[PDB]
Amino acid sequence: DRDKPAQIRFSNISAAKAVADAIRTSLGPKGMDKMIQDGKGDVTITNDGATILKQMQVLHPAARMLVELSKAQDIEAGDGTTSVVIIAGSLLDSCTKLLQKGIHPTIISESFQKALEKGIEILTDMSRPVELSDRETLLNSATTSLNSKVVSQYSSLLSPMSVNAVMKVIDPATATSVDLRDIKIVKKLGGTIDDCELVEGLVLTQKVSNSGITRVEKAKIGLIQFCLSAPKTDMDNQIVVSDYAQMDRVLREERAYILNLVKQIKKTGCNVLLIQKSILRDALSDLALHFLNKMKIMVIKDIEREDIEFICKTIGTKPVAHIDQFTADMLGSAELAEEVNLNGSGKLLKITGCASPGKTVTIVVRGSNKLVIEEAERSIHDALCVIRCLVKKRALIAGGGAPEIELALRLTEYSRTLSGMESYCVRAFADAMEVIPSTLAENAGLNPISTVTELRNRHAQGEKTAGINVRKGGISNILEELVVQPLLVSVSALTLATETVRSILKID
């Protein structure tokens, strides 16, 4: 019998909401900051309850699906990560009614997967198609969501910078989802938010040039993945040294083989060299690097291992491990490589363009100090994601909790007109839909029960003539005062919870 896994399910259904019920307060731009008590004990004022899930959580398998639920919303959208929490606990309320009714969870699973496919179809008709190749249409569509979000204090000047950034990788009108795996975020320690801009190719950190060039035209991007030293067990220079001759005879011979490997670099043609950390190897010999930099090659050193793997795929500098991999395809081809030392504190190397597949786009984040720099980082990336979610889903939907009240109004109607032993499941699926804007219409104030029934007063007759407007703090049409969102941040918040729900229904 499934009676012992029956009790496991209701415990899992109850426990998944109980962590998610704190996010009901944290829902929306008028949502609540949630002060976190740490496992060692400390206060942490926190909003954006996906980050709360990453920070403080309990060890429960229904709760461990919740941190996975928001993480998928983080990587696919990055937005709607608070709303993706509230939809899943809303669906679990629908699950409790039907399991008490005596409906198999296999039935409740497949009914939700049908209604998910069915709801986004009707939601798409609610959406309006916007351009993805018109740069100006993308500008108006993005910043209205950016003014709809919390941070717009720096998103004003940083919206069109992101618009010009994505427009380079918008080659078709289809305009695929977006790789952020060519988008590099680069901090500059000084400078200004006004001086933040988009530098093509990739932007490097501190160079280490012994006698090397500063500005090389038509550079050759090289990679080094080999050591320049002796084996190490206790000492880098394994001598039992007490003598001047034994330290002279063996260490001049260490200079000998690194003479010949350095000459093979410049003869094959190299101007920019990618060197990882000397803890990612055993040692890197700077005297050979001095002789290398005396052969007029600009060199950076001490970069991360996986960060090179970002660089190799972005600018086409395919991995060079030895002398034999000195070729024309393993080496990238920059048009101009130089370092900018001025316009702000610090100094950052500029690979201004490279022979790159697609378009390698890099932003330089500036600011007074690190906290001011970190303000723009959320400001750019949220601006990057709202463009990213609109090029994934062509049409645009006005945001503000109203299309859920729209869609639940149709899905109750269609589930009656369709048929079903599972018709209750879809009609309970639609009853879960208006929970989330109701919990949003608590954070706006202005009683949500009185609120939510008067939006589908307008969604039934005029199909929308009033909305929930956090600008007004309540009843105002999201088409009257424009509150919009991409289509993806609503759909991706919707579909991941449905896939999560059908799993835990089938989970014993």
Next chain:
Amino acid sequence: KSRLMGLEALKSHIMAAKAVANTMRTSLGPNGLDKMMVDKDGDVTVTNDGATILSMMDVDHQIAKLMVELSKSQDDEIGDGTTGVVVLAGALLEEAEQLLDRGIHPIRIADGYEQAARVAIEHLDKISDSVLVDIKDTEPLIQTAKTTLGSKVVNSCHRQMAEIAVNAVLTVADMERRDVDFELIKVEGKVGGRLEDTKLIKGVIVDKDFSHPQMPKKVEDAKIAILTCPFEPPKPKTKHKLDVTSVEDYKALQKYEKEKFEEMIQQIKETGANLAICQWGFDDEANHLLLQNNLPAVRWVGGPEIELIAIATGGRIVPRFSELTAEKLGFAGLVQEISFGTTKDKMLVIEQCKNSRAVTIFIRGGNKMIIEEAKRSLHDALCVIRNLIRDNRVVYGGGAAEISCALAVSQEADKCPTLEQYAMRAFADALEVIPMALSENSGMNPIQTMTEVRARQVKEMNPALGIDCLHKGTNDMKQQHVIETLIGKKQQISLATQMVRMILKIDDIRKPGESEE
């Protein structure tokens, strides 16, 4: 002092309503599973009717104490449908918790429950056309009382019972502006013969007395002597002293009283009404002497039995032997004698073509247990026909009209889009609990059952095609012939929203230790 505020009130309002709605939903329809009762005297009782059991169950809660008078209004007016008002109103009630758990205020839904009741009654005007002529509509009532008889008290439908029962009502309706009074009719049941035996009496019946078959067993002209005065020596249950001077004085006393027997004859017979009935009784000695003296007399008549024959005839009763007139005699249409049962004795059936003030269907039984179960099927069949004789409004209920208004009220939550939409939603989903409950107590899956006729509402609106509960696989309401009165279903709408309105009436839930104690 403990106060159970709001939800804490409603949790007390859940548990009794949850109990009583669940015991009714196992009892809807001919697949309804029977209700067992042990009395306060410790007596086994098995019915399937709620208005019996709610009267018999010792109610112990404000919800439960309500249900006696709530089901009193349904059974006295409509009859059948005692279970459905309890299943429906509790299903709004348990959903109203979910709305209150959703945060929806209990007042704004109680406001909307009444408006949800309006649009359902509005829909019944469109459902199931209301014209059924007098000769024809007996036959669906012949079919309707076939359903009540042929599955509950007797497995194979006494045909003589359902056809007499539609005929007793036209006896009173014509004299009473196309309506019947339930004190002008009476479901009279006396076992002793055969359970197949069933008669219609336009008046009342009394057991006819004859003392010897050697003395003539008479029946004659259609006029009854409704008497309390002595035509035969009476007995008010006491004793004089007996004294005669001589034995030959008693020999002459038999010759003296024989002339006195003829004097009681020649007074009554010259006024008319040769069937003499006197209230107080006597032995069989001078009874067959009066039978020999050529007028029959009925002895040991019950007290109120002289009243019911008086109003059935419409005439009066003769109080004294010296006051003698025909207006104080019975005015009968037919006085004939038919044997009581098949084996014991005979009655004297006094029919009238004048006054239908007591029209009694007279049934017999071979079992004492079956007849009140038979009469309870006959009690509700005579109440539903009162709805039809006034207006011929009918409903195809049992699963057709339940899913039909559940479409409409849920649509009216969208057509009338405001705050009461969840109240209309709590009304609409609760309508689906009923044809679920006709299949829940049935062997069928009720989850499959709500699916089929829902697709039929996509096919056809205003259905005469709803589910079956005879497991014939033929889901109709006009070929399955499951048809009820539109007035009765509309009354069930009013009663169910009455109870939810009734438990909402004060905001007081405080006690001094004594509000249910």
